[PDB]
Structure formats: structure tokens, C-alpha cells
Amino acid sequence: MILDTDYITEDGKPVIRIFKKENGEFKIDYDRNFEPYIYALLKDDSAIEDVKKITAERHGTTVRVVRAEKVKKKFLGRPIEVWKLYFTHPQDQPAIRDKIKEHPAVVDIYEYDIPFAKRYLIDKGLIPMEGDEELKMLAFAIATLYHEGEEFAEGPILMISYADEEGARVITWKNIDLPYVDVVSTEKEMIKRFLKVVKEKDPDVLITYNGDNFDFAYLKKRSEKLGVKFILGREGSEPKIQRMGDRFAVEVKGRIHFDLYPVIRRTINLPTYTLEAVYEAIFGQPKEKVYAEEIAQAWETGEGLERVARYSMEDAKVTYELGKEFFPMEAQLSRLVGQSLWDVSRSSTGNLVEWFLLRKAYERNELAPNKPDERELARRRESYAGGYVKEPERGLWENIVYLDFRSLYPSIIITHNVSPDTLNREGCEEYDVAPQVGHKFCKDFPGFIPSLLGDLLEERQKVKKKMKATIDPIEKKLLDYRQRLIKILANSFYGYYGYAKARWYCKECAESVTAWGRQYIETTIREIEEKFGFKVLYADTDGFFATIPGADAETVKKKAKEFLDYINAKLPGLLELEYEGFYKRGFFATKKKYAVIDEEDKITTRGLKMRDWSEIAKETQARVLEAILKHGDVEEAVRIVKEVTEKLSKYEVPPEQLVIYQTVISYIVPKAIPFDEFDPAKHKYDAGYYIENQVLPAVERILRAFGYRKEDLRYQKTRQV
DNA sequence: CGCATT
DNA sequence: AACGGCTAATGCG
């Protein structure tokens, strides 16, 4: 299988290198015949001879146009004839492209900023990570000596740890009596020892946590300081450090540097992204943190080195465990988009869809539109109307059904053929008109993006059905990842349409999807109210909560299923309303804030989780929510708040339930102090603060839906007037 | 202007 | 390597 591609220069000519792993054998294939090129639209074909003589200079070397060739392509459906301009080296393109564009006879230029190695994968039809090859992985981490006022890597590396299927080990240059610690004489010997491990193990994947911005950079400065050749690459190269905006990225040639940090940063939402917090959230097991001060103190005093070595070992162990959990998913994402695992794992949603579209456009001989210039980019900052949000019906509701559209926005794109190549296309016999915005979309032929979206949904069904027949549980998990990633990719087209930097940006397409969405959700609401007597309690972009106030649970279920049969026969194309779930009771506090409970007694809460909060505020909110959702007792929920505020005012609440966590700082507010130093016998907490700034704000938002003000929840201080 | 829901 | 800065809008604190 293909791992990655790049290029080196030999005598001024680019040489593509294809890194492959076939039958357990690492291979490098070379291609010296791939020519870099760009397209040029000319107003007069006779002018091509003047364009061929355009020259530029890179670094003393004179840049010229090797040859030109007139080709026929499509541009947003319409046929086009453009000039394919060939060059010697891909770096010639940034040097002459501006001079070619500024030439009077040149209308515009296209596909001039596509990286050579990525242009190769697309043009050759090569797909990375495709096949049944098993990759050998190795995780690693480092521990360093830190002092407050010193430069980067001014202190030596104290330890280097690594982990794989064989277990985790630590290399250090001090005596630590642990079975997994290997003791060498110096820091230089420790680094050299690590290089031998990587060389002997020969892993296909090197797994780190923030290795892009710390580990590799620290090792590099240290090897330079000590005179060590940091050859980690399979071709004897040192790790290549690149600039990715305000951060860095590292690639180890011949292998895949899998940095878990950017991956987990996009996949899950956590308050902090320390290795300890990430591991505890994904595996549900704790991990102790050992800070730089403790490691420096332990190394200088020589006491407590077992704790530092154990921390170093756990870093490599958990990085390997997390890598084992997230790498197969990233491999399926890589194979789907058609780009290397290295790039896809570090790429944003907008870049992932663009690379998928770039490949599909090449397959269909479709000329790709350019990225926007600064002027066009400023024009695209105008926003549009989004989803519809109904103001919720106050009060507690019984027997609620949640109905929503199956993939509303992708269904709209496919059903109404929403695409820049079908937008206001004159000469068609059939059109679909977007409500409110009025954009017309030709229905005579399938559009570029709706056709790809249709192929994605078809491919997803072909992978869902292959899962059911697969006996191999490893292959089933892999297919589950591909199927999930196709759903995520399909649901990224809408946002991409309104992404100002996108090549296939189309505000008209984006606002037409939301206008159609607003129409389908609003018409279905009036339909269920007028023809079925339902009360719609709350609705967001693609779904709504409804009930029949004077009806039993079986009655509401039956009528909801009858309504579904009714509207689904009226909905066009792929649009489909579904029965998402039934809820015993629920309250809709404000827009985006609500809570429901199913027949199993599982409570689902949105917008109420909420920042640094004391355990007393979290406890009372949960107690209030439970009284309302499980007991159906709103008056009990108010008494709980009155009881809590009364206990706080009379100082009957233990200080342990008043700690606020925000390094995590654990403090308590006095009548501003770390909780370790707080003494109830000497000091007094601010009862007013914990009532007015903690308990009441957390609960008020919930009880406001039932008609209670903040004053309706404070302790009844009896004023004997 | 942050953070959450869609 | 000379592309990437992180898809959208609505709406509560």
C-alpha cells in the first residue's frame, strides 16, 4: 500500500518518491517523468507564441515554459478549451505564474497552486492506505530539565520513553531501579540508544502527543548541541520540520509521524487537552501528572526518580494506547479523501472536502476554480440566514415525540440539485426554486456536487451491507469507520458552500439549502398542528418536539406514526421525516436549552451542562433536574433551591462542596484562597457569593420556564413587620 | 465576545 | 514542501 509521496530535485528536475509497504517490505518507487503544469485561458490563440517566450528567475536560474498544449475540459459543466502550460520544476510555477497572468492576452490561469506530490496522487489515480497491509507502530515521549528563565532546549533531556505491543521502556542516564528502565552513561548515549531502538524496530508509524511542536524540536536542538546525527528517516534523513501557520509539523521520511494532539483536538471536546485529561476521558482510567518543577527537583536531589520514570513510562504507554484507538480511523479518512495519513490527520474540514473535490474534478475532466484573492475574499464575508429556531413553549410537558429529517441538508442538495454548475443555468426545461432567496437550480442533468453526494450515500449503503456479511471483526470495525466518515464528509458539503476560502464556494447554494430547510421544518410544524392537533413545544434546524396535551402515551405514539406516513408521501425526493425517540417528560427552558427523560429514565440535557463551577451548584442543578424529570415535581425542585440557599446562609454546608476548579487551581471564595489553606474554624466562606453567583444562576435558567423568578427560590427570611 | 446546538 | 489559519448560522450568558 501507499503510505505517502514527495519529491526531491536531481539536476533541476523533480523526482517523485512513492513510499510503499508491500507484503511487509518497505519500498521507494521513483518517477522522473511527471511534469508540473498550470492552465491558461487566452482571449486569442495566436498569442500562445508570446506566452511561450515569457521568462522569470528563481535563484539565478532562468525559468521558462517548456511546452504548451491546447486541451478540452469542462468548467462548471460548460465545455472549455484551455492551454496546458508545462514546466521543468514545480517551483517554476510560483516564479512565473504572476508574469503569465499579467500578460495582456491572458484572461486567467488555473490549477497553479496545487502541491506537486498531491497533484501526482490525484493525476495517477493513486490512493494511500488502500489494502490489507499491517503497519508496525511505536510511540515515544521525553522528559526534560527546566529552569524558569532559559531558552528552548537549554536544559538536557533527562529521559526518553517508548512503547509498543512488547510493552513500555524508559532510557535515562541516571540510576533508577525499575525493571523497564535502561540506564546509559550520558544524555548523548541515551539519544544514540533511542536511534538504535527505532532502527531495529523499524516502525511504519511513530506516535507522539504534541511531537509536532515539542518533542522533535527538543531532540533536534539537543542532537545539534551534542553532535549526534538524528537519522530517524528510513532513507537516512533527519525529521523534516515545517511551518503550519502559527504552529509546526514534523514528518519522518519513510514512516508516518502520527501526532495525536491535532487529531484529538478535532475529534472530541474537552476543557483541557493535556495527555492526562485526554487519556482519562477516552479510557476512563486516571493518569497522574508530574510537573517540570518536580522533575527538576527529583533530578537534582536524586530522590523521587522512580515517580518520574513511572510518569515517563506511562506517557509512552498511553500514547501507544490512544494511537491504537485513533490511527485506524485516520487511515480510513486518508483512504476516503485520497491523501496521506500525515496530511489528513493535520487537516481541517474545509481542506479535507477540497482535496476530495479536487480528485473528483480531475476524474471528471473538470477544471477546478481558483482560490479567492483578497478582493473576492472580502466580497464573500457577507453572511446569510441559517436554520429556524422556534421559541420554546414554557412549562413541563408529558409524552413527547422527537421527529427530525434524515440528513436534511444533504437530502436538499441531492433532491433539488443544488450546485454552482446548476445555479441559474439558462436553457433548461426544468428547475427547482429556493423559497425566499429565489435561486433557481437546473434539474435537467445531475450537478457535480449533488452527483458526488449521491455516490457517497450509495457507497455508504454498500459499506453498511458489507459490515453485516463480514465475519472478520477487525474488517467490520474498519468498515464502520469508513461508513461513519462518509456520513461526516457528506454533512460537510453545506458548510463548505459558505466557506469563503473554498474553491467551490457558493453563497447562493448555501443560503438555498438553509431556506429550503426553514421551509420544510416550518411547513411540517403547521401540518402536524393543523391536521393532527399536536402542540409543537420546540424546534431547531431539522427537528422538533411535539405532544398532544390531553392524550395518553400510546395515543401520541400512534398519531405520530400516522403523521409520519402522511408527510413522507408529500415530501419530495430524498426528504424523509423520522421517529427519533419518545420522552416520558421534558421542559424547554430557552432556545438551545432544554432537558428530556425517556421511558428507561435516562435524562438528556442540552445547553445546561456549563466553565468553573462549585460542587454545590452542580449538585443542586442535578437535584433540580432529577425532581422535575424523574418525579415530575416542579414544586419540589423549588424547595430544594430554597433549602440549599438557607443552608448556605446558615453556614451548614461543608467547605469541600464549595471548591471551584479552573494546572488546575482549586480555590474557595471568602467573606480568593486555595482550598488547602481554608479552615472553617478560622475563616468564613462568602455565603452570598455561593447563593447569588453559583447556585441561583445555575438553577434559575431551568425554573424560569415554569414561571419562577430568582426571588421565588431564595430562603424565606421571615420579616416580622 | 465565549461556548454551545443545530 | 511554498496548500493549509481550522465548514456554516442561531442564540444564551
Curated annotation (Swiss-Prot):
The entry's keywords: Disulfide bond, DNA replication, DNA-binding, DNA-directed DNA polymerase, Exonuclease, Hydrolase, Multifunctional enzyme, Nuclease, Nucleotidyltransferase, Transferase
Lineage top rank: taxon: Archaea
Catalytic activity: DNA(n) + a 2'-deoxyribonucleoside 5'-triphosphate = DNA(n+1) + diphosphate
Cysteines engaged in disulfide bonds, as pairs: 428-442, 506-509
Extent of the signal sequence: none
CDD domains assigned: DNA_polB_Kod1_like_exo, POLBc_B3
EC code: 2.7.7.7
Top-level EC class: transferase
Primary role: In addition to polymerase activity, this DNA polymerase exhibits 3' to 5' exonuclease activity.
Family: Belongs to the DNA polymerase type-B family.
NCBIfam families: pol2
Protein name: DNA polymerase
Native species: Thermococcus gorgonarius
Gene designation: pol
